[PDB]
Ligand SMILES: CCCCCCCCCCCCCCCCCCCC
């Protein structure tokens with residue numbers, strides 16, 4: 015027996031598909047930074063793409079652990095171009111803020127259904143989203159310090175190029 | 179800047195997107211095997227999914243190496259249900275045979291324009307595709323021997339569960 | 343004592359339920375031993391030990407908040423089941439009952455704003471997810487098995503390897 | 506099938522359930538010493554409780570080795586309070602003596618049936634009971650010398666806290 | 670800043686409370702040193718360093734959520750107690766007050782559906798259980814010691830061994 | 833017995849309370865640098881705060897080593913804001929020069945009282961304060977050479993981030 019309500023399963027399945035989209039979006043930002051020729055920003059976006067995949071697989075495993083099933087949905091085409099580096103990263107910040115709210119919505123729905131297991135499972139994402147937001151604000155802050163000066167952009171490129 | 183024709187850039191970009199669908203398709207086969215409860219087949223499909231991402235990224239890299247740019251397209255919703263194990267693996271073989279012909283088409287197009295670099299690049303894929311088909315055919319030959327017998331299916335599950 | 347008497351009693355009741363759970367799994371070891379499945383015996387003995395550690399975590403938490411543990415009688419558990427599948431079906435049902443009892447303590451602790459006990463119980467919520475699932479995974483393998491002895495022996499070996 | 510008499514199987518099964526009661530009793534003495542705030546005594550009682558489980562399991566294995574089956578019985582509520590350290594260890598001693606006599610009774614019953622296999626099996630427990638009784642007499646005799654001096658009780662709590 | 674001004678202010682105040690907590694344990698060390706108990710001194714100095722890490726945890730969380738930290742004046746703490754037992758009950762009473770301050774932030778965050786701050790505070794809810802319990806254990810040992818100097822020396826070495 | 837005069841004990845206790853404020857002050861500059869987004873300057877200042885605590889603790893011990901007693905006084909509120917990176921470090925230099933003079937005042941009080949022990953104990957801080965002053969001056973000079981050019985600011989931000 016599936017021991018999550020169907021409406022919590024679809025909320026989880028929906029979030030799983032949003033995590034797949036988030037990974038595709040960062041790959042698309044990588045395509046942008048690669049066209050712009052910043053190998054370090056490219057490197058950073060590829061790691062973010064694979065990191066979001068692990069988020070999706072976390073949802074994957076919990077759905078099956080609670081007796082549900084996963085259904086993959088179509089993945090909409092992401093933007094392929096931005097108005098500069100600050101533009102791409104602010105789009106990332108806004109995006110992760112949307113992801114956090116979508117996860118917040120699942121938590122409140124689970125809490126209202128007295129689904130304590132799903133409430134507890136999502137705490138990892140609550141904490142993780144704090145870090146996903148902060149790291150992008152850090153880059154945005156450093157980018158505003160550079161203020162388009164290429165000597166500093168190279169430093170920030172090579173800094174983000176070291177992400178493991 | 180770009181030293182591939184737009185006809186070859188577009189064939190490569192389209193194949194890149196098909197490799198992304200390939201990974202999504204194999205992930206969806208994992209959701210099916212998880213629903214049916216075959217951990218080894220799940221494992222095998224998850225590893226196939228990650229192999230297809232590397233196929234995509236080899237196209238990604240080659241496009242930029244020749245001065246092109248990659249544009250990510252929508253990913254269609256993959257099927258989530260099959261009649262049984264053998265049908266899923268037959269769907270995989272059909273898929274890989276289809277990707278082989280699509281690569282054959284890029285190779286013939288590149289050869290037509292005397293883009294010898296892209297012809298040579300696709301040789302790796304010609305050789306990889308022979309093994310992608312053969313591995314699925316070996317499984318199908320075993321499933322046809324298994325003939326739906328659960329004790330023998332369980333052996334093949336554990337066997338494909340050992341994939342590295 | 344810094345837990346309410348009503349929460350202290352709930353924890354103490356759950357400690358005794360956790361000891362009963364360990365005894366129950368020992369009784370399933372007695373059953374599989376009578377039936378001659380060494381691997382299922384192994385799994386059940388390892389499961390009985392795991393419930394003891396659960397009980398002791400309630401033990402320690404009660405004393406950490408100024409409480410005292412009172413051990414109650416342990417009811418006689420069933421000693422027989424109608425085959426391997428039936429015993430694991432009883433296990434799944436039992437663990438679900440354990441999950442609901444933990445949920446109930448968590449809800450009582452929440453409405454008393456006993457945040458320490460709420461947070462303490464999170465560990466058991468997450469653990470209960472696994473205990474339910476690992477029995478569900480066994481049941482699904484048994485359903486496919488359909489009593490076929492070659493597959494049951496394969497499953498005895500798999501469960502005999504639990505550490 | 507079973508090569509112990511039903512009368513000896515019942516005697517062994519009964520004693521297995523006494524061993525489980527013994528471990529529960531000692532756990533209960535741990536609950537008492539934990540309320541009293543003597544860490545070392547708690548540790549000792551927890552170690553004694555685990556030791557009685559190895560006793561129960563030893564009977565378990567012999568019963569199955571002789572073609573018998575184990576049936577677990579209800580476990581009585583143990584006392585949860587004593588009138589002091591000496592009183593608790595005195596109850597432990599009295600309990601171990603009762604266990605010894607219960608074990609002796611099985612030995613005499615099996616020897617009257619010429620069930621030599623069960624006679625020989627029980628030798629291990631005859632010897633163990635000598636140690637179990639002696640270890641409690643040792644503690645009681647040290648407590649007599651302590652004579653309520655908290656400085657010496659602390660020393661003794663530390664010593665029994667070192668039990669491996 | 671993505672925490673509300675009431676939640677940032679509660680967090681900033683708790684940061685300053687943690688710093689006073691570290692200062693308080695430091696003068697408790699000044700007390701035990703005047704009284705000539707090196708082990709209790711050692712224990713109190715270690716408690717001081719631990720409270721700095723509590724403060725620094727609130728520090729980091731405030732910045733991770735886009736807020737800023739403002740350091741406030743630190744009150745002069747008591748410098749004397751009328752004995753070992755009195756010093757530790759001041760410690761216990763204080764940690765209980767810290768727990769309630771943390772509970773208030775938790776409920777404030779919860780009413781604001783600020784799940785991130787709620788979850789961040791779980792670590793402290795769990796930590797405070799152990800901070801209270803370790804002082805209770807010490808007090809319970811001091812009651813057994815009952816002013817006997819030979820036993821006080823024993824407890825002095827024990828707490829002197831804290832890592 | 834106390835073998836320092838009350839005025840030298842009182843001077844030493846004031847310096848102890850002054851050393852704690854210095855640590856609190858440097859902690860507050862970290863709050864400033866963290867708000868400005870300079871993680872390396874934050875690192876430097878947090879480690880400077882820990883060094884001031886060790887200064888406090890050396891006064892702590894010496895007071896007890898000559899039979900006195902420490903009384904902790906209120907810590908008066910530090911500033912939390914500066915008009916830029918170098919202005920903060922200008923405050924740092926200004927502060928430690930004040931500490932050096934406060935230490936000099938104790939040394940003279942000790943010299944006139946023929947308290948040779950306190951005179952000698954303080955020569956550690958005399959020598960340490962020379963380092964403390966030079967350490968900030970050198971930072972100040974590089975900030976002036978950098979001249980607000982962030983590529984150079986970023987570089988010694990990372991430089992001071994390497995402090996042990
Ligand atoms: C460095 C390359 C990153 C590319 C990310 C592409 C994301 C969008 C397409 C998703 C395809 C399916 C995901 C496969 C997951 C494989 C299973 C992982 C199990 C832990």
Ligand SMILES: CCCCCCCCCCCCCCCCCCCC
Pocket residue numbers: 361364365368387390391394398525528529532551554555558562
């Ligand atoms: C391997 C077989 C396990 C059988 C368990 C039967 C449980 C019945 C209750 C008996 C009392 C158990 C007391 C256990 C004390 C353990 C303390 C460990 C340290 C925290």
Ligand SMILES: CCCCCCCCCCCCCCCCCCCC
Pocket residue numbers: 688691692695714717718721725852855856859878879881882885886889
């Ligand atoms: C070294 C052993 C004694 C420690 C006593 C600590 C007393 C603290 C009093 C308040 C001081 C506040 C400023 C401390 C900043 C420390 C920052 C640490 C980050 C690494």
Ligand SMILES: [Fe+3]
Pocket residue numbers: 033036066069113
């Ligand atoms: Fe994510």
Ligand SMILES: [Fe+3]
Pocket residue numbers: 197200229230233234277
């Ligand atoms: Fe492929």
Ligand SMILES: [Fe+3]
Pocket residue numbers: 524527556557560604
């Ligand atoms: Fe025994």
Ligand SMILES: [Fe+3]
Pocket residue numbers: 687690720723767
């Ligand atoms: Fe604290």
Ligand SMILES: [Fe+3]
Pocket residue numbers: 851854883884887931
């Ligand atoms: Fe200093």
